Write a protein that binds this DNA or RNA. Structure first.
Ligand code: SF4
Length: 374
DNA sequence: TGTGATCCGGAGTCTGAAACA
DNA sequence: TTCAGACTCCGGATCAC
């Protein structure tokens, strides 16, 4: 019964990692998101070799330029994408990089889907056995294991665990451990889907925050006693702007879509009399984001572009008694957490927010963050 | 046959050199 | 002080020998 010890040692290590990151990085438990499965496949296409914020902004640009005229409904007109020339769809996702190659891959995927089934949809893939779905997804040109595992785990709710560069490095550095896939998949094949989802989410966030490739924050890492690099060893990055929290009954939020039932964070107002409103990411996207919105943090807000360009004149009486919270502006998640102490990261993730984007409400497209904020 | 390169590509940080002295 | 190149980012395909 060696496998009895094989699964027990990893389960104890995995649950210790999950419990510790719960206090530091907030609640990463599974919560459903809307959207179809073709959105997830295109997202995994767009996340090949690029940072997460760039890929998410590229998908937002795809949604904005091609708009729709767990509710499994398309947010993007994929028929128009297949109709659109490779040059224009490469222009849409230029900022992500590899625009032309990925545009051709996406057009080929959509064309093959139409040829196979006569319609761009993959809802029936949740009814087939998991292995058949994995083989069908692997049969596509431009998709490999790391992607199809992400698609299955985050969208099809199967039992899967993708091993990307961040996961492998963390596993090697910690007491754990295609070679990494062979070591981990048999040892991590029978666990609850919610547990796999939470582990994956906290692993990617931990790779972004504490355990980076260059100069990991080993001083403030909660896993110092369980690591090997720490065992063997022995600002312009972020701008903080204190803001006000706006209850949904406030007059300023009269025409702001009245949030979402499942959104865990409220609206914010960033005063410079004049203020800019910060719209939460889940509310701004109205759910319906690929891969269960694991591209954003739990405490992530956008910046209203119209409010940023022309701040709204507000009286000081309306915002007199509202509580005050930080936002920790910046340009990327890894940069704004560099050098931060454990208490600061915990406070930011539990009683704080994070903004690295600007959102245009009218066009639903990403915009660069304004100069004064960062 | 099993890696081992070389490609794709924008956007950012970060060094090292070439600079003040 | 300027400043350009290497490197990193939730990766596949195509040769080469
Ligand atoms: S101690 Fe350092 S190397 Fe180890 S897991 Fe933490 S950040 Fe990564």
């Amino acid at each position: 019964k060696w496998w009895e010890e094989e699964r027990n040692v990893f389960r104890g290590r995995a649950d210790s990692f999950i419990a510790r990151m719960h206090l530091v990085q907030g609640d990463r438990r599974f919560t459903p998101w809307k959207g179809s499965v073709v959105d997830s496949v295109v997202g995994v296409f767009l996340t090949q070799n690029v940072s997460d914020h760039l890929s998410s902004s590229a998908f937002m640009s795809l949604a904005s330029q091609f708009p729709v005229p767990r509710s499994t409904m398309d947010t993007v007109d994929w028929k128009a994408i297949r109709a659109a020339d490779v040059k224009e769809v490469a222009e849409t996702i230029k900022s992500r990089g590899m625009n032309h190659k990925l545009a051709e891959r996406i057009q080929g995927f959509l064309d093959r889907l139409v040829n196979d089934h006569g319609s761009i949809d993959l809802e029936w893939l949740r009814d087939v056995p998991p292995d058949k779905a994995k083989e069908y997804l692997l049969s596509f040109n431009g998709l490999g294991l790391k992607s199809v595992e992400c698609v299955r785990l985050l969208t099809l709710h199967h039992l899967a665990f993708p091993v990307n560069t961040n996961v492998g490095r963390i596993a090697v550095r910690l007491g754990w451990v295609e070679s990494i896939q062979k070591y981990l998949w048999p040892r991590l094949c029978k666990l609850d889907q919610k547990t796999l989802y939470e582990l994956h989410y906290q692993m990617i966030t931990f790779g972004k925050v504490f355990c980076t490739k260059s100069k990991p924050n080993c001083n403030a890492c909660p896993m110092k006693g369980e690591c090997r690099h720490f065992a063997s060893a022995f600002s312009q990055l972020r701008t903080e702007h204190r803001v006000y929290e706006l209850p949904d009954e406030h007059p300023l939020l009269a025409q702001l879509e009245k949030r979402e039932p499942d959104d865990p964070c409220s609206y914010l107002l960033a005063i410079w009399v004049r203020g800019t409103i910060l719209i939460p990411c889940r509310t701004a996207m109205r759910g319906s984001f690929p891969l269960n919105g694991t591209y954003f943090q739990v405490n992530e807000v956008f910046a209203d572009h119209a409010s940023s360009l022309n701040p709204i004149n507000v009286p000081r009486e309306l915002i007199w008694e509202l509580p005050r919270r930080t936002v920790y502006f910046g340009t990327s998640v890894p940069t704004i957490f560099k050098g931060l102490s454990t208490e600061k990261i915990q406070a930011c993730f539990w009683k704080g927010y994070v903004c690295v984007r600007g959102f245009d409400r009218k066009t639903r497209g990403p915009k660069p963050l304004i100069a004064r904020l960062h």
